[PDB]
């Protein structure tokens, strides 16, 4: 897999979700999806008291199924330089996964 796993909470009915972080070097690329909190056991601790689920764990077996719930993604470095920029895409200011209208 070779990748750092990150998990950011998405409040119910939430639409926008910003995430601040900074890399001092250069990696390989991004990869992402969406998981349900109830179906995601809190790892790190030798026991989860709030884990009342026994179905497949997308976070482990890789049974994702919520990739069709994304609209767009915007990446920017130094909070100004949009990536990839250079007017690469039809919509150079972001990656529109799907449009309604």
């Amino acid at each position: 897999l070779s990748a750092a796993n990150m998990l950011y909470p998405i409040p119910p009915n939430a639409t926008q979700l910003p995430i601040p972080s900074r890399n001092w070097a250069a990696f390989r690329g991004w990869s992402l999806t969406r998981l349900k909190q109830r179906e995601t056991p809190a790892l790190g601790s030798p026991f989860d008291p709030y884990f009342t689920y026994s179905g497949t764990i997308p976070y482990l077996d890789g049974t994702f199924y919520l990739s069709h719930t994304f609209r767009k993604v915007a990446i920017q470095f130094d909070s100004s330089v949009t990536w990839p920029g250079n007017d690469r895409l039809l919509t150079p200011n972001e990656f529109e996964i799907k449009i309604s209208v």
């Binding site: 070779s2 926008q16 979700l17 995430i19 972080s21 390989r28 990869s31 992402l32 349900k36 909070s79």
Partner: protein, 99 residues
């Protein structure tokens, strides 16, 4: 049928057991594990700050945004003498968290 009433089209799609990808390449193609941009001076010389904004459909329940910063998680194993294992890990970027 002739009894058909005026309707309206509706499109959508599904893609399970998969992960959205956004390679860090100038052309998005895979020309080697160590991408070209991942070897560009602009990044190896100075440090920067990243900020992503994900707009998704609203759901009536707590969810999570599983991100995967593809990196190089490699480790060398050195065995000098009998019953002696010396290993050296190295995950770059994100050596040991971010702060």
């Amino acid at each position: 049928d002739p009894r058909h009433a005026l309707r309206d089209p509706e499109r959508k799609f599904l893609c399970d057991r998969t992960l959205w990808r956004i390679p860090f390449s100038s052309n998005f193609m895979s020309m080697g594990s160590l991408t070209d941009l991942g070897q560009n001076l602009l990044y190896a010389n100075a440090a920067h700050a990243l900020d992503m904004t994900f707009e998704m459909d609203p759901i009536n329940e707590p969810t999570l945004l599983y991100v995967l910063f593809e990196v190089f998680d490699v480790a060398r194993v050195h065995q000098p003498h009998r019953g002696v294992i010396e290993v050296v890990y190295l995950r770059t970027p994100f050596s040991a968290g971010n702060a």
